[PDB]
Design a protein around this ligand. Structure first.
Ligand SMILES: *[C@@H]1O[C@H](CO)[C@@H](O[C@@H]2O[C@H](CO)[C@@H](O)[C@H](O)[C@H]2NC(C)=O)[C@H](O)[C@H]1NC(C)=O
Lengths: 436, 145, 48
């Protein structure tokens, strides 16, 4: 039972690859054994992607796991949609409905939009690069129109790392033009820390500023250097280190030999890596179901040339894709489930706020429930509704003409009622007008 | 990728062709590598790719100027993704410095079965903020529609 | 003391620090250079 699969990794995705290997050992069985052929490639370069794919094809793989740039993804969704080659990726969702692509990464757009109405923002600054498409930026621009938002969208990815300073001052002059205080960060994790660092230096990380980090790995990056700033930081987590499944994973993970499994010696794992670990499990259950349903899938020969004219897809590609898309398993990123296009559904996304004692979940988001805050309400909100007793006498305290339709404090009028305001105002407290 | 190589195997000396936002990278990377020269009337690259002779001139600069000529400050920008959101970002990047209130409504994702409905649902939605100044940014056919 | 100030954000405009030694430029100053606070100090070695 020697099954051949394709592995496409970008230069220097070391933790993702180690996670791929731990996944190998963990989900390896004796029914069959996935034989992965690995291709180390500059994933940004499309030429090298086209080549590396054709290599995997010509060897005769049954499915390819890999990553893609937004610059490269089109070559992927084409050669996969054509040759019916199955592709598994932790990379960002495809702009639309592409076949034979199993996107492990959950859709994030729906989550982000919920959080914005939650904090009740009305005017903010959306910063971005293009490296995961602009399908998110479209989402914040179509929403803003329909819910009345003023959004200052600034493209901050084209900034050269050779003169990366004057570009930031002029950025935070334009962001000081409207006194912008609320800022969203939808960037590569590298670009995230570079911006945070700069923000610290110019002192825009104190109370009065509120940043929202738009990725699936909140505690993935570095949080401690703005943890005491005063500014409130929110973001999303797809890896809950409280789940016994993930918790048991971390124990073996954090203790592996680091000369052998690079970057795996930590108490935390990147979501990009974690999804790769989840992707392995899906590739196993997929080919397991294919034999449990007794369906044959072995290659009837060479795949020969991928550029073969006219292109003729192998048959079982249809069968294999279905097996993948019909998988339901539980892994590092909560529950896993797909639709017919390979997008995540029914998935959980943790909402985390940065506090004093560290990152903290305030709730979770589902594609069906939208924003749900975990019942972790605090007793801090004093709101001690100071009970104010009074007498029904004229003109000190009197009922309004239509006090029936009104409620609370609005029911009453008079000298002491007016006084109750001026007292509470100068003394600073919310109060309830009640008659003795 | 198949057509480009089919032309290349024959040993052509240059290639004239058209591309798309979902294929531009392929043309570039294979012309950057194989040093094949590409002559295109299509929209220019959002970068500095060599061996690609873009026949159509850059529009970006002109549109920015014309908007400034009309002395606008608040407008709607209906856009089509088909030619790469380069120009959409060009006016968005400028939205700060030039002080513009830009509403960017995507439109390159509608179908021709409900074409007459959604187009009316867009305009009877900008009867809300009551704007009167619009920019179209579309292939001629999406203009006339 | 600087780094501690940096992290809690007490180096923005409105704040003001006076470093009381003859070596103002003997120590790191870049990490407070753009914050907003006012920094003053004494230099006993004029490089000019
Ligand atoms: C949708 O996701 C939910 C929650 O992730 C899945 O629920 C679990 O279902 C299993 C098997 O029935 C139970 O053992 C667990 O207790 C559930 N976990 C929960 C509720 O946290 C569910 O399987 C998914 N639904 C579908 C239709 O796929």
């Amino acid at each position: 039972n020697s099954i051949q699969i394709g592995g496409l990794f970008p230069r220097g995705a070391d933790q993702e690859y180690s996670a791929f290997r731990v996944g190998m050992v963990q989900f390896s069985t004796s029914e069959f054994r996935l034989t992965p052929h690995i291709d180390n490639l500059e994933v940004a370069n499309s030429f090298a992607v086209t080549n590396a794919f054709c290599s995997q094809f010509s060897r005769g793989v049954y499915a390819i796991f890999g990553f893609y740039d937004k610059k490269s993804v089109n070559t992927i969704t084409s050669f996969c949609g054509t040759l019916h080659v199955s592709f598994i990726t932790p990379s960002f969702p495809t702009d639309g409905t592409h076949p034979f692509v199993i996107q492990m990464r959950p859709d994030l757009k729906g989550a982000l939009l919920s959080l914005i109405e939650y904090y009740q923002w009305d005017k903010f600054a959306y910063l971005y690069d293009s490296d995961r498409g602009l399908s998110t930026l479209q989402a914040v621009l179509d929403s803003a129109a329909e819910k009345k938002w003023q959004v200052t969208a600034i493209n901050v990815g084209n900034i050269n790392n050779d003169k990366k300073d004057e570009t930031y001052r002029s950025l935070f002059q334009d962001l000081e033009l409207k006194k912008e205080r609320r800022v969203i960060l939808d960037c590569e994790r590298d670009k995230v820390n570079d911006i945070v660092d700069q923000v610290i230096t110019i002192g825009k990380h104190v109370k009065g500023y509120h940043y929202i980090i738009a990725n699936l790995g909140f505690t993935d990056g570095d949080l401690l250097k703005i943890q005491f700033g005063g500014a409130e930081v929110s973001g999303f987590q797809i890896v809950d280190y409280d789940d016994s499944l993930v918790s048991k994973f971390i124990e073996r993970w954090s203790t592996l030999e680091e000369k052998e499994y690079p970057g795996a010696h930590t108490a935390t794992i990147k979501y990009t890596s974690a999804l790769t670990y989840d992707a392995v499990q899906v590739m196993t259950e997929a080919f397991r179901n294919l034999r449990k349903q007794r369906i044959e899938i072995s290659r009837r020969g060479n795949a020969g040339d991928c550029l073969a004219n006219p292109a003729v897809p192998w048959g079982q590609g249809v069968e294999i894709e279905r097996a993948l898309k019909q998988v339901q398993v539980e892994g590092l990123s909560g529950n896993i489930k797909f639709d017919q296009n390979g997008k995540r559904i029914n998935y959980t996304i943790n909402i985390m706020e940065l506090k004093t004692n560290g990152p903290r979940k305030i709730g979770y988001w589902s594609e069906v429930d939208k924003m749900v805050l975990t019942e972790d309400d605090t007793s801090g909100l004093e709101q001690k509704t100071v009970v104010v007793t009074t007498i029904l006498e004229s003109p000190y305290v009197m009922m309004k003409k239509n006090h029936e339709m009104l409620e609370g404090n609005e029911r009453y009028e008079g000298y002491c009622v007016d006084l109750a305001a001026e007292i509470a105002k100068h003394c600073g407290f919310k109060y309830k007008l009640t008659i003795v």
